[PDB]
């Protein structure tokens, strides 16, 4: 699994592969590892698919019920609910989640929640098995207040390398753009990203 | 038991 969230000028962008593997066999080659917990709060799921799906479902319910009573929740509030589930059930969960949302006050925010259930607010995050190979690349190449096209290229080139070296990562590169404009889904096919 |  290869997932990452990058915060840029107009908001945040979520990026992931589409490969789910049982052992060395690919169960699904078109997985959607980017999931909606609220209209402009999305997360990236890594680890046990069963565990990350179950968690994501609970939070969406929590933020829906939050919205009914207190209106739109902050990205921090969403990350806090994710953390609460991940931390309190750390013994029974294998889930590395990157929470990314767009407020109008706070703009683009990225919170990473590793296995422990700790919360880390970052300018960009990378997680999953494939991430290891692109720590060097992402650190050298990331800049703050990038444009949409720069951030899309940064994520595309990063996940392209992650996919190239990681057996557990492959297929298409899905991306989700969170800005004041709204929500935009992007897809990139092997024939494009492989020969970057 | 049985499997399928």
């Amino acid at each position: 699994t290869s997932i990452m969230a990058v915060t840029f000028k107009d908001g945040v962008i979520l990026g992931a592969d589409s490969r789910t593997t049982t052992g060395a066999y690919i169960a699904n080659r078109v997985t959607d590892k980017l999931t909606r917990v609220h209209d402009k709060i999305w997360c990236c799921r890594s680890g046990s698919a069963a565990d990350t799906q179950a968690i994501a479902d609970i939070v969406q319910y929590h933020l829906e019920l939050y919205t009914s009573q207190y209106g739109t929740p902050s990205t921090e509030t969403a990350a806090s609910v994710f953390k609460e589930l991940c931390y309190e059930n750390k013994d029974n969960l294998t889930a590395g989640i990157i929470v990314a949302g767009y407020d109008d006050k706070n703009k683009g925010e990225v919170y990473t929640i590793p296995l422990g259930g700790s919360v880390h607010k970052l300018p960009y995050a990378i997680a999953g098995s494939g991430s290891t190979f692109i720590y060097g690349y992402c650190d050298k190449n990331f800049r703050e207040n990038m444009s949409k096209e720069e951030t899309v290229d940064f994520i595309k080139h990063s996940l392209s390398q992650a996919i190239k070296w990681d057996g557990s990562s492959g297929g298409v590169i899905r991306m989700v753009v969170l800005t004041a404009a709204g929500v935009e889904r992007l897809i990139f096919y092997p024939d494009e990203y492989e020969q970057l | 038991f049985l499997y399928x």
């Binding site: 009573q69 207190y70 929740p73 902050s74 921090e76 509030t77 806090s80 609910v81 609460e84 | -």
Partner: protein
């Protein structure tokens, strides 16, 4: 009849007489007020000095919830404390799960649903307090007043206790004379005056004034008590107006 002997029983009118009886206990209590201002709220209360033996400044009636909400009440003082204890649990569990401190409207309903719950069963007594509370959140200042029935609304000014009609009349004048808004430091001085004017309906025993305030500029959005120079300044303002 006998419709008034049990809580949660509808009279043929469609009324819960036990809640109306709890209101009489509130009407009997000392005067407490709330004044919404530009960037916060101001709370004030009448403390009847029963005896010389009462230690001044050491029978505090205004209570803080979390770090940003202030609560004051008239009627059965213990019932008020029970409601604030609940409010503090509600505010703690909200912060625990959602990280952010509880918004005032969110907090208001947490008390509202709890007080309303004590009108649903004959095994519990309604609350013998009207609670004036509020503070500063992400959306700005909010003042609320909550009644034994579980009924609460947002207020520009709120008053409850024996001198409520006197205080309300004085509050209505401020709302009319200051449409653009009242400043935090002004509201503290007005709060003092209104308690002194509302003391005319409770004038056998002389009293002790107690004021608190949340203000985005003055207290940095946190609840603080008005003490020392600022308190004496407000008392002197009120003393000048009655004469």
């Amino acid at each position: 009849t006998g419709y008034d002997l049990s809580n949660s029983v509808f009279s043929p009118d469609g009324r819960n007489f036990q809640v109306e009886y709890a209101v009489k206990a509130v009407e009997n209590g000392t005067t407490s007020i709330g004044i919404k201002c530009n960037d916060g709220v101001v709370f004030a209360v009448e403390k009847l000095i029963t005896s010389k033996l009462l230690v001044p400044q050491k029978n505090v009636k205004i209570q803080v919830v979390d770090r940003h909400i202030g609560c004051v009440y008239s009627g059965l003082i213990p019932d008020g404390r029970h409601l604030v204890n609940r409010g503090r649990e509600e505010a703690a569990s909200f912060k625990k799960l959602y990280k952010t401190p509880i918004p005032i409207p969110a907090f208001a309903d947490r008390l509202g649903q709890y007080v309303q719950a004590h009108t649903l069963y004959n095994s519990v007594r309604p609350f013998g307090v009207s609670t004036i509370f509020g503070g500063v959140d992400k959306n700005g200042a909010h003042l609320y007043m909550l009644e034994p029935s579980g009924s609460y609304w947002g207020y520009k000014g709120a008053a409850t206790g024996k001198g409520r009609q006197s205080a309300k009349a004085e509050l209505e004048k401020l709302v009319d004379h200051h449409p653009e808004g009242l400043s935090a430091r002004e509201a503290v001085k007005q709060a003092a005056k209104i308690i002194y004017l509302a003391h005319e309906d409770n004038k056998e025993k002389d009293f002790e004034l107690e004021i608190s305030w949340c203000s985005l500029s003055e207290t940095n959005g946190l609840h603080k008590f008005v003490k020392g120079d600022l308190l004496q300044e407000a008392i002197d303002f009120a003393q000048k107006e009655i004469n």
